[PDB]
Design a protein around this motif. Sequence first.
Motif, mmCIF file in Angstrom:
data_model
loop_
_atom_site.group_PDB
_atom_site.id
_atom_site.type_symbol
_atom_site.label_atom_id
_atom_site.label_comp_id
_atom_site.label_asym_id
_atom_site.label_seq_id
_atom_site.Cartn_x
_atom_site.Cartn_y
_atom_site.Cartn_z
ATOM 1 N N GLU A 8 0.931 -1.093 0.106
ATOM 2 C CA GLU A 8 0.194 0.035 -0.146
ATOM 3 C C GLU A 8 0.984 1.196 -0.069
ATOM 4 O OE1 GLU A 8 -3.411 2.156 2.736
ATOM 5 O OE2 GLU A 8 -2.418 0.313 3.488
ATOM 6 N N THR A 11 2.569 1.841 -3.552
ATOM 7 C CA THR A 11 1.446 2.112 -4.604
ATOM 8 C C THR A 11 1.290 3.777 -4.256
ATOM 9 O OG1 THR A 11 -0.285 1.672 -3.282
ATOM 10 C CG2 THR A 11 0.515 0.085 -4.867
ATOM 11 N N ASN A 15 2.033 6.336 -6.978
ATOM 12 C CA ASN A 15 1.104 7.349 -7.631
ATOM 13 C C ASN A 15 1.136 8.568 -7.259
ATOM 14 O OD1 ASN A 15 -0.488 5.328 -8.915
ATOM 15 N ND2 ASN A 15 -1.709 4.513 -7.095
ATOM 16 N N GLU A 136 -2.953 1.883 -12.554
ATOM 17 C CA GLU A 136 -2.916 1.764 -11.030
ATOM 18 C C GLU A 136 -3.256 0.341 -10.819
ATOM 19 O OE1 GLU A 136 -4.488 4.805 -8.834
ATOM 20 O OE2 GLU A 136 -4.578 6.146 -10.455
ATOM 21 N N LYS A 140 -0.496 -2.577 -8.885
ATOM 22 C CA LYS A 140 -1.053 -3.317 -7.681
ATOM 23 C C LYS A 140 -1.066 -4.641 -8.208
ATOM 24 C CE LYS A 140 -5.430 -3.704 -6.788
ATOM 25 N NZ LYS A 140 -6.888 -3.945 -5.980
#
Lengths: 146, 144
Positions: A8, A11, A15, A136, A140
């Motif tokens: 998490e 990412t 991002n 995205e 993931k």
Amino acid sequence: EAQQKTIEAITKAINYMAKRRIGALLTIERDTGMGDYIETGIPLNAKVSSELLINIFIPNTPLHDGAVIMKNNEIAAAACYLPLSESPFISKELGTRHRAAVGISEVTDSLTIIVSEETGGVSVAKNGDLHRELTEEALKEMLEAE
Amino acid sequence: EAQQKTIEAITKAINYMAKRRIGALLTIERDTGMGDYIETGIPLNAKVSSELLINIFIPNTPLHDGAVIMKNNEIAAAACYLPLSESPKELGTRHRAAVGISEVTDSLTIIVSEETGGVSVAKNGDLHRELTEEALKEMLEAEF
């Protein structure tokens, strides 16, 4: 488990930098020891967080000039030196980080994420392969497998 | 005497951040517990280095507002909250935080001014303004 945090974390770091165009290079070690590439960097052995990864790559900060290596669930070192690939399949008009990501992935089982500073596109490189312009959910999904 | 580096690291971070007027707020734990305060920040438990210290305090970053706390040669945490000092002026929020934690602890707090770029220290409730590279260095030998 402890896999979820840290994916998490990555990412949200990836991002964030993407929206803004900050070049990033992050490599996650697996079964091929990268200890010889870690000693070329600034050692952190720090606990992995989104805020810290953002701070490591800031366009002209001291720590920004190279690659962040991940081992365990930690940032082993920042500003590392990787070896480049003389692959013709890397589209030029780009490079530097892109040629070091595939360059390191030729010699290692590792996984490398790149954010382009020109466009903001997330790439990934494994086993000598460079996949440009990832979504995205594709990042993931790629990471969750790791 | 392998704690010179830490002093070296701090002195380099602070001396680089002073010449760029990069605000900063660095407390080093000494004997009191700061764990209350540490838990309020972003945990790093990183090794100390000037570069990581300098990176923490760059203005755009999500790690720069707050104080980083040091725990025995390691940046324990960053973006930590330090209790403000209620006392008598016209100084910044960063300096009120430095005096506040030094009243409740024996920690040594270094701060760098957004505006001036001059270096400060807070210890035992007192705030030494306008330090020199060497003044800070000997001061920083508050570890024997």
